[PDB]
Amino acid sequence: LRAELLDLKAGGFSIRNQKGEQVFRLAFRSGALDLDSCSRDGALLGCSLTADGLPLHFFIQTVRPKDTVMCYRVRWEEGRAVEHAMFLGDAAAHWYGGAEMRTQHWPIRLDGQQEPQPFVTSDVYSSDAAFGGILERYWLSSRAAAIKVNDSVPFHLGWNSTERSLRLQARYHDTPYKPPAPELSYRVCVGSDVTSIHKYMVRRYFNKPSRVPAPEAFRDPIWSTWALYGRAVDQDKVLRFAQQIRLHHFNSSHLEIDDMYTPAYGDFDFDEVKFPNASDMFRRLRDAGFRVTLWVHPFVNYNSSRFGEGVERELFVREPTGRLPALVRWWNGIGAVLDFTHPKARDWFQGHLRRLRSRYSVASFKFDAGEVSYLPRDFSTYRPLPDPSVWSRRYTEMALPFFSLAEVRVGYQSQNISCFFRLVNRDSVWGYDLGLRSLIPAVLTVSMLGYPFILPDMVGGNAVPQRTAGGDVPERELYIRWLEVAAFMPAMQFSIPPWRYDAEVVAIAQKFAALRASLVAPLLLELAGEVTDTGDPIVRPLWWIAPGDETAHRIDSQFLIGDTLLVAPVLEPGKQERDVYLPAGKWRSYKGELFDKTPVLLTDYPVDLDEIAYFTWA
Amino acid sequence: ELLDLKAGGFSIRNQKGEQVFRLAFRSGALDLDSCSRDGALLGCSLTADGLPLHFFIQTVRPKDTVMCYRVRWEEGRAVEHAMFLGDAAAHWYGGAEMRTQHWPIRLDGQQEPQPFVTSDVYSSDAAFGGILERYWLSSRAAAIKVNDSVPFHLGWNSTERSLRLQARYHDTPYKPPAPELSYRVCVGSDVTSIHKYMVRRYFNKPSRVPAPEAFRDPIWSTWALYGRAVDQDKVLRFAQQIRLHHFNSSHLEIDDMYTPAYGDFDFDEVKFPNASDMFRRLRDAGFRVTLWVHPFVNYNSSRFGEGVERELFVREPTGRLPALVRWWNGIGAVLDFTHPKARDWFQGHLRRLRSRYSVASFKFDAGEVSYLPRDFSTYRPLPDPSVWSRRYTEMALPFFSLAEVRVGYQSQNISCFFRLVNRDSVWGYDLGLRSLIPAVLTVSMLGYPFILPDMVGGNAVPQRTAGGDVPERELYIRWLEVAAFMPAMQFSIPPWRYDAEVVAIAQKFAALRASLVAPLLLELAGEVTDTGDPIVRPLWWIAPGDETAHRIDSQFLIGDTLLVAPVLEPGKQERDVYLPAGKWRSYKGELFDKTPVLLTDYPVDLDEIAYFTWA
Ligand SMILES: *[C@@H]1O[C@H](CO)[C@@H](O[C@@H]2O[C@H](CO)[C@@H](O)[C@H](O)[C@H]2NC(C)=O)[C@H](O)[C@H]1NC(C)=O
Numbered sequence A: 001l002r003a004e005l006l007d008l009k010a011g012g013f014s015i016r017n018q019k020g021e022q023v024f025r026l027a028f029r030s031g032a033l034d035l036d037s038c039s040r041d042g043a044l045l046g047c048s049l050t051a052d053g054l055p056l057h058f059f060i061q062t063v064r065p066k067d068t069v070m071c072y073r074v075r076w077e078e079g080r081a082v083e084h085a086m087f088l089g090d091a092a093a094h095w096y097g098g099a100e101m102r103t104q105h106w107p108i109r110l111d112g113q114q115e116p117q118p119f120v121t122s123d124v125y126s127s128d129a130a131f132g133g134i135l136e137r138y139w140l141s142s143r144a145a146a147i148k149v150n151d152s153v154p155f156h157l158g159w160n161s162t163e164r165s166l167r168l169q170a171r172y173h174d175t176p177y178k179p180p181a182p183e184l185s186y187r188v189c190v191g192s193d194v195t196s197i198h199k200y201m202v203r204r205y206f207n208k209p210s211r212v213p214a215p216e217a218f219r220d221p222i223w224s225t226w227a228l229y230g231r232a233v234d235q236d237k238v239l240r241f242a243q244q245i246r247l248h249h250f251n252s253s254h255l256e257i258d259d260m261y262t263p264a265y266g267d268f269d270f271d272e273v274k275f276p277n278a279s280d281m282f283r284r285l286r287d288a289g290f291r292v293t294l295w296v297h298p299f300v301n302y303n304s305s306r307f308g309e310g311v312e313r314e315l316f317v318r319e320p321t322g323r324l325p326a327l328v329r330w331w332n333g334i335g336a337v338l339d340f341t342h343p344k345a346r347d348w349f350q351g352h353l354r355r356l357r358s359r360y361s362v363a364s365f366k367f368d369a370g371e372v373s374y375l376p377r378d379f380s381t382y383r384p385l386p387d388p389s390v391w392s393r394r395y396t397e398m399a400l401p402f403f404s405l406a407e408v409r410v411g412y413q414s415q416n417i418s419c420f421f422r423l424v425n426r427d428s429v430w431g432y433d434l435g436l437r438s439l440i441p442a443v444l445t446v447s448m449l450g451y452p453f454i455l456p457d458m459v460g461g462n463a464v465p466q467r468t469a470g471g472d473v474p475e476r477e478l479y480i481r482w483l484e485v486a487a488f489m490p491a492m493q494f495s496i497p498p499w500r501y502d503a504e505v506v507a508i509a510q511k512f513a514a515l516r517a518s519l520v521a522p523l524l525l526e527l528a529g530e531v532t533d534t535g536d537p538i539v540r541p542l543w544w545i546a547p548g549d550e551t552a553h554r555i556d557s558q559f560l561i562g563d564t565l566l567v568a569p570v571l572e573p574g575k576q577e578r579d580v581y582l583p584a585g586k587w588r589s590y591k592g593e594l595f596d597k598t599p600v601l602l603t604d605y606p607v608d609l610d611e612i613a614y615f616t617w618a
Numbered sequence B: 001e002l003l004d005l006k007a008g009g010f011s012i013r014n015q016k017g018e019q020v021f022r023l024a025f026r027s028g029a030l031d032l033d034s035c036s037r038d039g040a041l042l043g044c045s046l047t048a049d050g051l052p053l054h055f056f057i058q059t060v061r062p063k064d065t066v067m068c069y070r071v072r073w074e075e076g077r078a079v080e081h082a083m084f085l086g087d088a089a090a091h092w093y094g095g096a097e098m099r100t101q102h103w104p105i106r107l108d109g110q111q112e113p114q115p116f117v118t119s120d121v122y123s124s125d126a127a128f129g130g131i132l133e134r135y136w137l138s139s140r141a142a143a144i145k146v147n148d149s150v151p152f153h154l155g156w157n158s159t160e161r162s163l164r165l166q167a168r169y170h171d172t173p174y175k176p177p178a179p180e181l182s183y184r185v186c187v188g189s190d191v192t193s194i195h196k197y198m199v200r201r202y203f204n205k206p207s208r209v210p211a212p213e214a215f216r217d218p219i220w221s222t223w224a225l226y227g228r229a230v231d232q233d234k235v236l237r238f239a240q241q242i243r244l245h246h247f248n249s250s251h252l253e254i255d256d257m258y259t260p261a262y263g264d265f266d267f268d269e270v271k272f273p274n275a276s277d278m279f280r281r282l283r284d285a286g287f288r289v290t291l292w293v294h295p296f297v298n299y300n301s302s303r304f305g306e307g308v309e310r311e312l313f314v315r316e317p318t319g320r321l322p323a324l325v326r327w328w329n330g331i332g333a334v335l336d337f338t339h340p341k342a343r344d345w346f347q348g349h350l351r352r353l354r355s356r357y358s359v360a361s362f363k364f365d366a367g368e369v370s371y372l373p374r375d376f377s378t379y380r381p382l383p384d385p386s387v388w389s390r391r392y393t394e395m396a397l398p399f400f401s402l403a404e405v406r407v408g409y410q411s412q413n414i415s416c417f418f419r420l421v422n423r424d425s426v427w428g429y430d431l432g433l434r435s436l437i438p439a440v441l442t443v444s445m446l447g448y449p450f451i452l453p454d455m456v457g458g459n460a461v462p463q464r465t466a467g468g469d470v471p472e473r474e475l476y477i478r479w480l481e482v483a484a485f486m487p488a489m490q491f492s493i494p495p496w497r498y499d500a501e502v503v504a505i506a507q508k509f510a511a512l513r514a515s516l517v518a519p520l521l522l523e524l525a526g527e528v529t530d531t532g533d534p535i536v537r538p539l540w541w542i543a544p545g546d547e548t549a550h551r552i553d554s555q556f557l558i559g560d561t562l563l564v565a566p567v568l569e570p571g572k573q574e575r576d577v578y579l580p581a582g583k584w585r586s587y588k589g590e591l592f593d594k595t596p597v598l599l600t601d602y603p604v605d606l607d608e609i610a611y612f613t614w615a
């Protein structure tokens, strides 16, 4: 059976574009159709029975929303689980989108075998199976086809590398999804090029942020206490850090005071031991020209002076019967988690944040955690969440009153929250496993999902022992190369500072701060103001401007800021040159060279330790 | 044998030809053409709808006078069989402690099968109480034991007078280690013989006897008298007042609340400034002391953190974190008595209280799985959740001599006292005066000889009290009188709360208990170890062929030789008394030797109980 350019068989379907290329192929894996049960009424193709003879609500509806776009609405509705296997295709077909992951490849590459698991916001820092804090049920092909899985679906995702398939599953057994009868539905749209079809899908499904964060956050470096000091942060260390930033002649968007400044997790005011005179600390920081943000989280531990208050006022996520709080474990221990569906728990959280601003003139907050992997398997909330990841959304709404200098590390339809979105903890390693090579794939993936204001975590990574190339801190060359690429991303955050290394590392950092300020920042601010209208990302893949270009489809070592700044950092140790691809148009190099014969690969393009290759539209 | 199997159910007859058991299949019907016989085994492979089935009936003749029928129905589809109680002449005993306790068993209205698990029935007429067994006995000398394997749920239907026996795994605290309903129906010559066979087969006997003074001297509890507000001064004033009114004491039981928070084991220094001195004074005044304990650690307990970190608590289903519970004293965790570490932790605190304060033993309160979460996990798995109650009652074993528990799930071989759940200060069968004999008989039937019928006069809860503030004078006296003849006797609201006559009546019944009742209780207690027979016996125990003895809920036996007939109604100075076969000497000296007989309008004044001794 043919529905426009879609071939339906018993065991699956395939779709072609007008050129006659196969741009989508899908197998039914929880059963087969009985084609004799299928009838066509206009654009609608419905089927009533499976091949085994079970009743079924299946349909394919053809929709022509534009002259150059054909969409296919698909529904398979049976307690029997639904699975369709979406084939990525041959080596020339490259896919983008889905979730932030621990090992982030661009284009998407998933190794081995994974049985479908809940497609929900998880902390992937320790897990290569899980799906990260920022995700969307959206996959885009370099062959100008895209799939959006319906928000209704109790959606689980697996993969099979042998047949290079995504396993799309709807199920209600062994999952944190509740019903408001499994149901897998989605829309496949086919366009003329990858950029056009992407823009159609983004405008249809994702909201835009309508505001821009503080302009200094797109220019001056952010300074975090976390990687430098860890939990042992205190009043003296914060002031010594602030002083050292000024003496080494660096600007600051703000200083972010991290874990731990409270006596217990759940308390909001300062530990009087480690911060004897917080008021004085903030007065000195204000006088020295530092805005300040504070690390906050949705947890109240059992030994918090606020745990009792939360239980009695019922501000916590509950066990399934909805009567008592449910205990959770996070990286800082055991307690409850605040229910952001509950107006009282929202007012309670907000009240403590407004008190910290009122008292200490704190500008905004680092909103840490927010993943449903830190909620119990099965739970209840003041308002029901059949889709559990909507809890992540509700937590990110806590940033709205302080959006201007706020960061969150989760996004579930959080795109219209006009704050920064931080990548989960990068490790001080070179590789794609949360390392230097993960940065461009991860930022591109997040940008694709409609989150323009991206903070790529910490320059040099978090320097976790056993996860650090160089033992104690990231090795010198890793720090420099990271610093360089980080200078061209929308927000830039140091923790382990340049003066931990040597005068040359400091000099390189000062150079990239100055270059960021004069070249990058004016363009970031223009593009940030443009988001409100266009909904286009700030960090763009090479294929954005060269959508018909197979090399631009594959590249993970280069990116664009808007359409006009092309960046090609060195991402390998012991290299003073790299290959640079210029995809289309005329490009002026940082040294003044005019390249007007494109597309072209520049072979062995010189880039010394203290340099990055960048090119501007001509 | 004498079992007729049809498609829709079966019936069983005794050798006299009476129908002693009738059961309907309610989750399907048998295809009789699928049934074949190999010796005593009758197996069937398909239902009437044509579904595959593991069904069998095996005939077993274990004794000359006993025929048993092993039945299995094994299908995720729930199994339900409806057991018919029969006509008005058929009377049934056993099952669970209930809020409204009738004898024989009477269940009103309609109840969908619900989990047959240890619950706190104080506020609930549907639920099954802390002491229960899947065991039902007929006055027609038939009994059923439901297999321990069954994920067993019980309902009832008063219209057809049926028990609804259900096996299901959906919406229940039962986990599997495929629903399965199996049971054994045994038929004997008389109700007492068949009961003794079933008890010896299924229930263990306690091999030890509690402290002899617990069967003689009254127990004194602070609970109904003082409530939570109990203090060091109040405990000492109570102890003094017991001595000044010339009463003996087995021991004084200090109840809720003596700790700063629930989960702490040592004394609140505010309400008990010098606990050591309090216990020294009580010891000098000749008082043994027991302490109220429970399996909960509240979130505001200084011990909650320790329990979380050492993982001593019942967990949520994934078995990683503690699960919070609500009980009558707030929100916290519950200790996992499947966990050796949590058992050692609990025991350690109890041994410290004995070592420090010379406390004799403990009141082990709660223990029902209705205070555990719907779905939970434990160090060792409990596919049958009520085994948690068993594991909690094992905490009494080292202090059994003066211990009480209020739950029993195969806890019979734990040689401590078993307390009825809170009696209310009312006359009726809803935890009132009329509930006492049915409840004690029901518990005795399940192989628990050492029974404590809670508090003389009840707990005096406002809105659940005949007389407002305390139980009305006549209720207190009648309760006191029947309580004097039960295996253990516990006052809380004391006689001197009322008047000199109530005190005098209490002193009389204390003296009578000491000289008549206590020597017999101790003999029968020592006999349990060998016979496994209860102390408190129904009239039908000695008169098993007697239809009147089958029905009576207002009389009981201590052993075979002491017959008790208390007044259980306000404004009555007489009652009808039934004497079964044999010769009886009344408390006034009258020889009744023309029996069985109904004594009509037998005089019993306010300060008296009717009792008779074998002659
Ligand atoms: C992953 O995909 C491969 C290829 O589709 C699956 O392997 C096939 O399995 C079927 C049985 O259903 C065999 O008859 C085929 O011969 C297999 N083909 C190959 C190339 O191995 C495999 O089953 C899938 N794995 C999972 C976990 O679903």
Ligand SMILES: *[C@@H]1O[C@H](CO)[C@@H](O[C@@H]2O[C@H](CO)[C@@H](O)[C@H](O)[C@H]2NC(C)=O)[C@H](O)[C@H]1NC(C)=O
Binding pocket: A207, A208, A390, A393, A413, A414, A416
């Ligand atoms: C911001 O984005 C959120 C999330 O998509 C929008 O919230 C949805 O709004 C519609 C219309 O009111 C509701 O029916 C949905 O239930 C909302 N979803 C959630 C998860 O809250 C919100 O309206 C957006 N606001 C703007 C102005 O863009």
Ligand SMILES: *[C@@H]1O[C@H](CO)[C@@H](O[C@@H]2O[C@H](CO)[C@@H](O)[C@H](O)[C@H]2NC(C)=O)[C@H](O)[C@H]1NC(C)=O
Binding pocket: B204, B387, B390, B410, B411, B413
């Ligand atoms: C006391 O009673 C308990 C419970 O009936 C007995 O424990 C059982 O012992 C059997 C056989 O050794 C085990 O297979 C069961 O697992 C135990 N059941 C439970 C629920 O714990 C115990 O053995 C009895 N002890 C004595 C001496 O009578």
Ligand SMILES: OC[C@H]1O[C@H](O[C@H]2[C@H](O)[C@@H](O)[C@H](O)O[C@@H]2CO)[C@H](O)[C@@H](O)[C@H]1O
Binding pocket: A123, A125, A126, A226, A258, A259, A295, A331, A368, A424, A425
């Ligand atoms: O503790 C402060 C720290 O928290 C977050 O990182 C933690 C992460 O969420 C865990 O998965 C990991 O095991 O532990 C990390 C801390 O050691 C946060 O992302 C980080 O920036 C910092 O705020």
Ligand SMILES: OC[C@H]1O[C@H](O[C@H]2[C@H](O)[C@@H](O)[C@H](O)O[C@@H]2CO)[C@H](O)[C@@H](O)[C@H]1O
Binding pocket: B120, B122, B123, B223, B255, B256, B292, B328, B365, B421, B422
């Ligand atoms: O509070 C001590 C008290 O506890 C027990 O009785 C409680 C019962 O378990 C609850 O169901 C009821 O709602 O509240 C009762 C206390 O008010 C116990 O049985 C009793 O003897 C005493 O120890």
Ligand SMILES: *[C@@H]1O[C@H](CO)[C@@H](O)[C@H](O)[C@H]1NC(C)=O
Binding pocket: A073, A074, A075, A150, A151, A152, A185, A186
């Ligand atoms: C997607 O979900 C919406 C809301 O549940 C529903 O109306 C629509 O029909 C679904 N689409 C398909 C193709 O099943």
Ligand SMILES: *[C@@H]1O[C@H](CO)[C@@H](O)[C@H](O)[C@H]1NC(C)=O
Binding pocket: A219, A220, A251, A513, A514, A517
């Ligand atoms: C530092 O801040 C000052 C004041 O806003 C500004 O004029 C200057 O351009 C900034 N320099 C850099 C390198 O960011």
Ligand SMILES: *[C@@H]1O[C@H](CO)[C@@H](O)[C@H](O)[C@H]1NC(C)=O
Binding pocket: B070, B071, B072, B147, B148, B149, B182, B183
């Ligand atoms: C009762 O349960 C036991 C243990 O699971 C089993 O072996 C036995 O056969 C069952 N009895 C019947 C009658 O099904």
Ligand SMILES: *[C@@H]1O[C@H](CO)[C@@H](O)[C@H](O)[C@H]1NC(C)=O
Binding pocket: B110, B157, B158, B159, B160
């Ligand atoms: C109770 O039994 C009657 C008569 O046998 C029957 O008609 C009725 O449906 C039963 N009720 C329930 C709730 O099963």
Ligand SMILES: *[C@@H]1O[C@H](CO)[C@@H](O)[C@H](O)[C@H]1NC(C)=O
Binding pocket: B216, B217, B248, B510, B511, B514
């Ligand atoms: C009370 O206890 C005393 C001292 O042990 C004992 O001699 C007496 O027989 C007991 N009397 C009663 C009525 O319990």
